[PDB]
Structure 1
Amino acid sequence: YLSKIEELQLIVNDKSQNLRRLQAQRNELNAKVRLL
């Protein structure tokens, strides 16, 4: 019963996703700074 709960452990992975999304937002900030 190793191959059940590793899937759950793959949400530590998903912490990189939030940081990814938010630095994508950070780039989106500078996008209209540079457009200005």
Structure 2
Amino acid sequence: YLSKIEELQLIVNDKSQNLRRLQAQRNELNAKVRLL
């Protein structure tokens, strides 16, 4: 309540971590096409 709200919302900002998951998919595609 007083000092317990913001980091929960920070873990919520791990949608940016999901953005990193998306860029991970991306670099997977790219690395393996380059493997081709």
Whether TM exceeds 0.5 here: the answer is: yes
Offset of 1:21 from its aligned partner? 1.0
Q: Which moved more, 1:2-11 or 1:13-22?
A: 2-11
Cα drift, residue 35 of structure 1: 1.0
Calculate percent identity across the aligned residue pairs. 100
Q: Deviations over 1:2-36 (max 9, x none)?
A: 20212322134211100001111110001111111
- SS of the residue aligned with 1:3? coil
How many residues were matched structurally? 36
Over 6 Å off, 4+ runs: none
Provide structure 1 residue ranges, at least 5 long, that are not aligned to the other structure.
none
- For 2:7 and 2:35, how far apart are their aligned partners in 1? 43
